[PDB]
Design an enzyme around this catalytic site. Structure first.
Site, short mmCIF file in Angstrom:
data_model
loop_
_atom_site.label_atom_id
_atom_site.label_comp_id
_atom_site.label_asym_id
_atom_site.label_seq_id
_atom_site.Cartn_x
_atom_site.Cartn_y
_atom_site.Cartn_z
N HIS A 69 -4.82 3.20 2.84
CA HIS A 69 -4.61 1.77 3.00
C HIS A 69 -3.37 1.46 3.82
O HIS A 69 -3.35 0.49 4.58
CB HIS A 69 -4.54 1.11 1.62
CG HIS A 69 -5.81 1.23 0.84
ND1 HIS A 69 -5.94 0.77 -0.45
CD2 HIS A 69 -7.01 1.77 1.17
CE1 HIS A 69 -7.17 1.03 -0.88
NE2 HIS A 69 -7.83 1.63 0.08
N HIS A 89 -9.02 2.01 -8.56
CA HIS A 89 -7.67 1.60 -8.93
C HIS A 89 -7.69 0.70 -10.16
O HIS A 89 -6.77 0.74 -10.98
CB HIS A 89 -7.01 0.89 -7.75
CG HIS A 89 -7.02 1.71 -6.49
ND1 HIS A 89 -6.31 1.35 -5.36
CD2 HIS A 89 -7.64 2.87 -6.18
CE1 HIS A 89 -6.50 2.25 -4.42
NE2 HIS A 89 -7.31 3.18 -4.89
N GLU A 139 -4.05 4.91 -1.35
CA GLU A 139 -2.91 4.13 -0.90
C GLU A 139 -2.39 4.63 0.44
O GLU A 139 -1.84 3.85 1.23
CB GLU A 139 -1.79 4.14 -1.96
CG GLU A 139 -2.21 3.60 -3.33
CD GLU A 139 -2.94 2.25 -3.27
OE1 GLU A 139 -3.28 1.71 -4.34
OE2 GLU A 139 -3.17 1.73 -2.16
N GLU A 167 -2.96 -5.65 -8.58
CA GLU A 167 -4.30 -5.45 -8.02
C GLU A 167 -5.41 -6.26 -8.70
O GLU A 167 -6.18 -6.94 -8.03
CB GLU A 167 -4.66 -3.96 -8.05
CG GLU A 167 -3.96 -3.13 -6.98
CD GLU A 167 -4.00 -1.63 -7.26
OE1 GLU A 167 -3.60 -0.86 -6.37
OE2 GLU A 167 -4.42 -1.23 -8.36
N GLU A 186 -10.98 -0.20 -4.25
CA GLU A 186 -10.38 -0.88 -5.40
C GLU A 186 -10.92 -0.61 -6.80
O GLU A 186 -10.17 -0.68 -7.77
CB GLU A 186 -10.37 -2.39 -5.14
CG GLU A 186 -9.44 -2.81 -4.02
CD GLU A 186 -8.02 -2.28 -4.21
OE1 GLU A 186 -7.45 -2.51 -5.30
OE2 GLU A 186 -7.49 -1.65 -3.28
N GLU A 191 0.84 -1.20 0.00
CA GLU A 191 0.00 0.00 0.00
C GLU A 191 0.88 1.26 0.00
O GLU A 191 0.60 2.23 -0.69
CB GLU A 191 -0.89 0.05 1.25
CG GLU A 191 -1.85 -1.12 1.48
CD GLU A 191 -2.81 -1.34 0.33
OE1 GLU A 191 -3.08 -0.39 -0.44
OE2 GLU A 191 -3.33 -2.47 0.20
FE LIG Z 1 -5.93 -0.60 -4.89
FE LIG Z 2 -4.47 -0.06 -1.84
#
Ligand SMILES: [Fe+2]
Ligand SMILES: [Fe+2]
Ligand SMILES: [Ca+2]
Ligand SMILES: [Ca+2]
Ligand SMILES: [Ca+2]
Lengths: 168, 387, 72, 510, 388
Positions: free
Chosen positions: D130, D229, D127, D192, D226, D97
């Protein structure tokens, strides 16, 4: 006194760099250190476990000296050796764009790093070269990346094969 | 089903019994403090420090690192993932920095979200209360839309100047602060557009399009030197510390603060405009927030580093001088904006007093910290010599 | 001089007792055999804003538990 | 005078025009591709709306943690093995992360379109969220769990072991060192989409099965971020699909990215799931096939075909090397247990039956070995036995792939057993596969990572542990342990007495 | 101990097993919607509605009540706990009202809390930014300290005018809205003091004591009629609806709006005062939030009641006329403050125009809703008489 972060060999260099007191000497010892212990083309791997740390400890000494020896204009456009940052940059980039192949391109890039890595060349110019040099190096390398079979690639790299084992 | 098919070890009798049976009588270590080995900046370790300090896997060859060895994968050429080579500044420990406001992600988005929701409410009250009726029409359609809007590109440019730093910062505490400094900047730029978009909804012939403020920014004359100073701090600087220092402890501390605080925040109220100040109140709150972090890093940590104090101050005095010039230039060009103001809006005696406020604040908050000898009278004179 | 400064609930509450003023008809509208003393004080020095914040923090944890973990 | 306001989309409509042209308006990073300066992003967000949507999630999450979960003693009523596994899972993901922050910061610098930059920026912030979320899991288990050691200092104690090196390759250096687009592929397109995303959810499933309601509370929240991302990675391809250089390089950077990520996760994740738990959710072989072949290699990658994207050429290879990969690695992880920052356990009887049922042949190889080590006393500190000794006695050297950092033992492995050893300019190099070998041959300067045998060469084991703080509060008992029970914990002295001294296995070819 | 002594039915194996065994195979009713019997104001029933409507145990003899029978314990004399006798207004259902912002307790304290934290952040940024330097000294020491300060008492009085309604409101939805309208008023009074306290910290010699603002309120001329009106609205009105209606749809809509928006909000900026407007923005936001609730209760629900529309409008017109005179008097005395300003600050035309803005907004948002025939120029001329 053995150790990962603190060992005799490291204590030995701190006392050594401490004897430095001239940007010329300091900068020279750094340029030479990088030729002796960094990159796959280093003169030897005797300092493999400590060179990364020792190098930085040298850069510090050179950095401090270059600050007290250069004027504002030069600290920004001049290398620790006296060269003109921009000149060196545009020159190396010239050669790179001329490079005939990846083998030649890699030599230039790596050599550039060993010679002009800060505190030698100003960061602004260095990373600017890193941007242009790296771009060219990859363009040549990543073209038909898998064409050359491993047998030949090993020869091209010039590695000394000591053992190969494959059941499949 | 009412119970679901998935059995959970915390509530399922069978599974839970097995787990409880395997548990020890007491914890296998009484030290239940994560980050306990971190050197506290204050009385006791804070949540901010525990969750942040050392998240970055730097090896010992990067001042402060606790790991060992080279990186596993590097750039073509050999450039390290992170390295001392990405900044002129040196230090005994890159993890020394501490955001005075102790902001990790949670507190950060909590504060900005409160601001967002209050902003929404405010706008709903403002429009419902018809306060727009008392706002000077020229000030709105010309100085807010064109000149204030154009300034959004200045902030946007400062925002983008943080991109490289987000990638190159040598520590976690420094990366988080940098990220937040930059995010607050894009926020301000988006708030400038928000106001123009709000005006467009309550003012029949107002166009929210950025075309006008953009042309003023790109081909204008008032912000010409400003833009030049921005394109440089952003795309010509490759040293992450130089970009952050120059942007926050030089340019934005002089130009930015003068434009926001000494021009619009000072003049808008005279044209019956409490709308723009509502948003500038945010920009200023942010500026003062970021400032505490900027000061802690470059002065408390670097500028006063037990081993590189002199070295770093030299480099910063060098940067200060290097950008103090393009900044003053950005100011002078801006001065030409007063000429387009209606007669009697303000006099040279006021602008001179405002400039000294910015300059004096700058000297007190930045320049004097790195022993940079700046002449208040000459600076004001240099800038003021552009009306 | 330009040090970050603010004002808290207790600092404002210090003057709350003075908010009420005298006038002939300032009296309760409800029947009562008693007389509540004009200068009685209160234990907690709160103001509307601070009261809301402390209750809001409680709601966050409560509803957070109800909506997330407990539901799961 | 109707109540009026303005939302995120209304401001975002003009976000694309925020950027203006000028000579030096270009990326500061070396790259072979050109991201179209008119690329759009999927989510029309501005900084303030972003903060609000995330703040709301934080509210629920921390509310559950501080209130109900704590009242239920959720931090304690977790199976010992899983409490340990989460030390690795949470902290290792934390660095993933964290580097993703720098990675997206690099992608943000790479994009030329204001919107594409804004998409990456949103991830930069996610991030960061996270990083702090994974940090919080360890923080919470340290504060309220059955064994704080490791959870409380993983950021430094993880440097002792070999599993950490490979984690840095796929989730640190792989995310930020190289062509921005390559890093994008390691992080988003492969990392990911293929692993991270499915992993986070799977972890919450294994967590719940083992009594852990703390991890699901945090990880499920991470999960909600997510989708932004995924779009970023997908948009990365769309941004270069037109540039001619793409057709020349995209597929090789992707394949290299694919091999890089699977090389580590294929063995490591299966190991953490099956061996770091008591209650099982699903056999890793089944999971891997669905994730990598069905979902990613099929559906996901298939949708990028119109952009010239091809299924990684090393895919067939990945599947052949996969089957026994995690089983082979746990043998090495347990044999080197003193180098970790978590306690490991040998499979119990129910588990051995489970492994055999799902992996025919498991018992005859791995099962008999574990029972041999246990009978010999690998769990008892007075035995003087550490499984690493069994590898030496039976001449089964353990190597570290120069590229991936993944430990491998060709003489014992039931899986891949290829070994390529080369010497170049006074330095030996050991490789475990043909793809990693090519990477080094073509880019020797990109891989000079010293392995643990090189750094610890000649050093006595207990000295390395003591030096890197591999001890618990009493300063005598090891953090790492060969069992998960509360008594008979190994001490630094129990290790010192073994007189174990590291040697570089490659020097035997001299 | 690590595990604790108390065993919990949700996690204790033995107890949970007992609980799971007694459970039905599925819910004993599929209607899982609390408050399903409530008539939704909007498309679907809202959380605000479900958690609020019918919480008040009224019997059917109080319009809309679902219970039956008399109260269990009444006042000495026989007065009911709640009854129709506490207000002149009538309706088909006292539970019809809906706060357009759908505020139940949680959303309410959430927003105010956000406003409190941002306020503290703002003040810290304002003081650190030294913006106080450009504020005109006279405006600060005379108008903010004394006159804006005295206004805190006006808002405090209006707050207190809600005490009886908090006790007599005939439904949950009305009691909650009433409570929140009042709580927002005490908040504003406290924010006026907060500002004075703040100025006292960043300005040497500035006294935060309420002595001066209070003496202005209790004995000055500028606020004399305002205070007289407030004392009446608060203590001479025993009808909870007359109180709420007259406060929000007459007095504060005219006098309040004029002082806050057309005087301080409008003039402060002219003296380099961005501080006071920060708080007035909150007050105006609160005013507009309450207005929506006030309009729904009095116009949408009562004034447009299918059975008592004509009656309620007659009563509200009555109240409007009753309180409009005291309100004009309050505004008329307030006109005296303009003479106190430095010459050139504002002029009769600006003042008159600002007066018309308030009056016109009042006619549009309130007077016209009940057919009250307001003469805008007659009202303004009556007020202008106070210009010294
Ligand atoms: Fe992610
Ligand atoms: Fe992440
Ligand atoms: Ca009088
Ligand atoms: Ca006039
Ligand atoms: Ca008339």
């Amino acid at each position: 006194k053995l150790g990962i972060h603190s060992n005799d060999t490291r204590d030995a260099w701190v006392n050594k760099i401490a004897q430095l007191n001239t940007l010329e000497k300091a900068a020279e010892m750094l340029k030479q250190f990088r030729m002796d212990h960094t990159t796959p083309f280093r003169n030897s791997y005797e300092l493999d476990n400590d060179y990364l740390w020792i190098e930085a400890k040298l850069e510090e000494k050179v950095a401090v000296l270059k600050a007290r020896a250069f004027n504002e204009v030069d600290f920004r456009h001049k290398t620790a050796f006296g060269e003109d940052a921009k000149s060196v940059l545009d020159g190396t980039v010239a050669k790179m764009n001329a490079a005939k192949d990846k083998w030649e391109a890699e030599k230039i890039h790596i050599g550039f790093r060993q010679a002009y890595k800060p505190p030698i060349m100003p960061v602004n110019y260095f990373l600017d070269g890193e941007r242009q040099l790296g771009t060219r190096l990859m363009e040549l390398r990543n073209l038909n990346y898998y064409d050359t079979p491993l047998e030949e690639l090993r020869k091209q790299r010039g590695v000394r094969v000591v053992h190969l084992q494959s059941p499949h | 089903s009412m119970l679901g098919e998935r059995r959970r070890g915390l509530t399922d009798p069978e599974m839970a019994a097995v787990i409880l049976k395997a548990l020890p009588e007491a914890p296998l270590d009484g030290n239940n403090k994560m980050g306990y080995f971190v050197t506290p900046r204050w009385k006791r370790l804070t949540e901010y420090e525990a969750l942040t300090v050392y998240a970055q896997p730097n090896a010992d060859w990067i001042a402060g690192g606790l790991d060992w060895g080279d990186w596993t994968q590097k750039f073509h050429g050999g450039r390290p993932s992170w390295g001392n080579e990405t900044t002129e500044l040196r230090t005994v420990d890159w993890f020394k920095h501490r955001d005075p406001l102790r902001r990790w992600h949670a507190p950060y988005v909590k504060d900005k979200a409160e601001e967002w929701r209050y902003t929404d409410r405010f706008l709903q009250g403002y429009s419902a209360d018809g306060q727009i009726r008392a706002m000077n029409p020229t000030w709105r359609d010309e100085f807010i839309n064109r000149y204030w809007g154009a300034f959004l590109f200045n902030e946007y440019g400062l925002f983008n100047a943080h991109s490289q730093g987000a990638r190159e910062a040598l520590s976690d505490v420094t990366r988080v602060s940098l990220a937040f400094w930059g995010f607050d900047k894009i926020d301000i730029a988006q708030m400038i557009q928000l106001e123009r978009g709000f005006l467009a909804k309550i003012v029949p012939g107002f166009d929210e399009s950025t075309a006008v403020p953009k042309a003023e920014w790109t081909n204008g004359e008032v912000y010409k030197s400003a833009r030049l100073a921005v394109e440089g701090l952003w795309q010509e600087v490759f040293d992450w510390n130089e970009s952050a220092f120059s942007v926050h402890a030089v340019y934005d501390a002089l130009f930015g603060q003068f434009v926001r605080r000494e021009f619009f925040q000072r003049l808008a109220p005279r044209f019956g405009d409490n709308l723009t100040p509502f948003f500038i109140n945010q920009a200023q709150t942010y500026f003062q927030i970021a400032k505490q972090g900027v000061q802690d890093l470059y002065y408390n940590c670097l500028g006063d580093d037990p081993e590189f104090s002199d070295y770093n101050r030299t480099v910063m005095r060098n940067w200060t001088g290097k950008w103090l010039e393009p900044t003053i230039a950005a100011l002078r060009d801006f001065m030409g904006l007063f000429a387009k103001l209606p007669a009697g809006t303000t006099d040279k005696e006021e602008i001179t007093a405002s400039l000294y406020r910015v300059v004096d604040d700058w000297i007190e908050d930045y320049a004097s910290r790195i022993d940079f000898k700046a002449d208040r009278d000459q600076i004001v004179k240099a800038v003021l010599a552009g009306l | 001089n330009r040090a970050p400064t603010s004002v808290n609930a207790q600092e404002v509450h210090r003057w709350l007792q003075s908010f009420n003023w005298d006038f002939k008809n300032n009296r309760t509208k409800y029947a009562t055999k008693y007389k509540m003393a004009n200068e009685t004080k209160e234990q907690f020095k709160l103001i509307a804003k601070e009261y809301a914040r402390m209750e809001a923090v409680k709601d966050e944890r409560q509803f957070g538990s109800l909506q997330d973990a407990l539901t799961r | 005078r109707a109540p009026t306001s303005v939302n995120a989309q209304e401001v975002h409509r003009w976000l694309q025009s925020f950027n203006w042209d000028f000579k030096n308006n270009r990326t500061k990073y070396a790259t072979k591709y050109k991201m179209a300066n008119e690329t759009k992003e999927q989510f029309k967000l501005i900084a303030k709306e972003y903060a609000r949507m995330e703040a709301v999630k934080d509210e629920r999450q921390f509310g559950s943690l501080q209130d109900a979960l704590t009242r239920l003693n959720a931090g304690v009523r977790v199976h010992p093995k899983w409490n340990e596994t989460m030390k690795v899972v949470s902290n290792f993901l934390e660095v993933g992360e964290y580097n993703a922050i720098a990675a997206t910061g690099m992608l943000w610098d790479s994009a030329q379109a204001a919107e594409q930059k804004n998409g990456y920026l949103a991830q930069v912030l996610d991030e960061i969220r996270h990083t702090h979320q994974c940090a919080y899991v360890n923080y919470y288990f340290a504060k309220n769990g059955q064994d704080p050691a490791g959870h409380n200092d993983a950021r430094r104690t993880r440097t002792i072991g070999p599993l950490w090196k490979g984690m840095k390759r796929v989730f640190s250096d792989g995310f930020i060192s190289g062509d921005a687009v390559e890093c994008s592929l390691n992080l988003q397109l492969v990392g990911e989409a293929c692993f991270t995303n499915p992993l986070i959810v799977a972890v919450t499933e294994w967590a719940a099965a083992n009594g852990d309601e703390i991890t699901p509370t945090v990880f499920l929240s991470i999960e909600t971020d997510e989708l932004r991302h995924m779009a970023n990675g997908y948009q990365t391809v769309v941004s270069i699909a037109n540039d001619p250089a793409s057709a020349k390089y995209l597929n090789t950077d992707l394949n290299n990215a694919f091999w890089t990520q699977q090389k580590y996760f294929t063995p490591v994740l299966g190991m953490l799931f099956e061996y770091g738990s008591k209650f099982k959710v699903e056999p890793w072989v089944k999971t891997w096939d669905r994730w990598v072949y069905e979902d990613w290699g099929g559906i996901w990658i298939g949708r990028l075909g119109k952009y010239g994207v091809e299924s990684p050429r090393s895919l067939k290879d990945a599947k052949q090397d996969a089957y026994w990969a995690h089983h082979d690695l746990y043998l090495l992880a347990y044999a080197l247990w003193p180098t970790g920052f978590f306690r490991l356990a040998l499979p119990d009887q129910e588990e051995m039956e489970w492994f055999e049922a799902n992996y025919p042949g498991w018992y005859d190889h791995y099962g008999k070995i574990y029972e041999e080590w246990r009978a010999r006393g690998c769990e008892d500190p007075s035995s003087g036995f550490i499984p690493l000794m069994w590898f030496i006695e039976n001449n089964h050297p353990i190597y570290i792939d120069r590229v991936s950092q993944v430990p491998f033992c060709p003489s014992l492995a039931k899986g891949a057993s290829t070994l390529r050893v080369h010497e170049y300019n006074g330095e030996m190099h050991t490789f475990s596969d043909q793809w990693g070998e090519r990477m080094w041959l073509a880019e020797p300067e990109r891989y000079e990572c010293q392995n643990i045998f090189e750094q610890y060469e000649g050093r006595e084991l207990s000295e390395v542990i003591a030096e890197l703080h591999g001890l618990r509060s009493d300063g005598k008992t090891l953090i790492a342990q060969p069992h998960v029970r509360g008594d008979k914990l190994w001490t630094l002295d129990d290790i010192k007495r073994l007189n174990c001294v590291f040697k570089n296995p490659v020097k035997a070819f001299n």
